[PDB]
């Protein structure tokens, strides 16, 4: 028995129930904001302004400047992050979330600018294509947690065949001190760093940037941005 | 979303 885990392999007892519980889960949580964030509904706005400020940088500096046609939203739930990050920063998004009764809310939720919301993906991470060559940004937010690491590790290299040229993938999620750690409540993990920059490696991406988030609550996992294409 | 630490 070793000082600790590092891969979801030595947590996940069985692959088919960590899906099928953490899909209940989420048909149990309230359409809110406060529901996406777990009771942390306080904190939107210190997160958004932050994913703002770094998402930026990729397309208003530089002389290959990502574009601004089309987001994809991953596990984007009722579109917190759609409304306030992605629609006033790209023509169209899409969101894919495994929960209808999000997606469903969201038109409601996203009000007028959410007629600029074309696909509503209903699927899980684990089992959708994004497209080739569609989007400027793929953007996963607070689920990475729900994929094995082979799903994982594949989601991300479909999600690089998808990327527009100069296009980015963001990861933004919640990393582990050290190892890999099950919530058995949801059913999740969180990993630590440097078993998410080996994912990442599978599945053939590059590092452009990485950044702790600032000024959360004490008593919360670290959240770290990644850029990668 | 956001956890508070194991
Ligand atoms: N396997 C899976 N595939 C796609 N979405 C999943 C998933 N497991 C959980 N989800 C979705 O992941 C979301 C986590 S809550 C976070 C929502 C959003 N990213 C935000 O930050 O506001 C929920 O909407 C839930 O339905």
Known sequence: VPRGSHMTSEVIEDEKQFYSK?????????????????????????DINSSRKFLQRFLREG????????????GAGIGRITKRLL???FREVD?????????????????????RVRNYFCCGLQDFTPEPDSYDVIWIQ?????????????????????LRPNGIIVI?????????????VDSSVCRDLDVVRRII?????????????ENLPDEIYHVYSFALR | GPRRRS
């Not at chain 1, 002389?63 to 991953?74: E, F, Q, R, V, Y």
């Not at chain 1, 469903?104 to 939720?109: F, G, L, N, R």
């Not at chain 1, 607070?142 to 998808?162: P, Y």
């Not at chain 1, 490696?201 to 988030?213: H, P």
Request: net charge negative; aromatic share 6%.
């Open chain 1, 87 to 89: 629609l006033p920063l």
């Open chain 1, 22 to 46: 953490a899909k209940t889960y989420w048909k149990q949580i309230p359409p809110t904001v406060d529901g996406m964030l777990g009771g942390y509904g306080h904190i939107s706005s210190i």
């Open chain 1, 172 to 184: 933004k999620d919640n990393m582990a001190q050290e190892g890999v750690i099950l919530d058995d």
């Open chain 1, 95 to 115: 969101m894919v979330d495994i929960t209808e009764d999000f997606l469903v809310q969201a038109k409601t939720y996203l009000g007028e600018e959410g007629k």
């Open chain 1, 63 to 74: 002389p290959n400047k990502t574009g601004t046609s089309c987001a994809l939203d991953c």
């Open chain 1, 142 to 162: 607070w689920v990475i947690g729900h994929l094995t690491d082979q799903h994982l590790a594949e989601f991300l290299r479909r999600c690089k065949g998808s």
């Open chain 1, 201 to 213: 490696c599978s599945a053939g991406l590059s590092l452009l940037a990485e950044e702790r988030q």
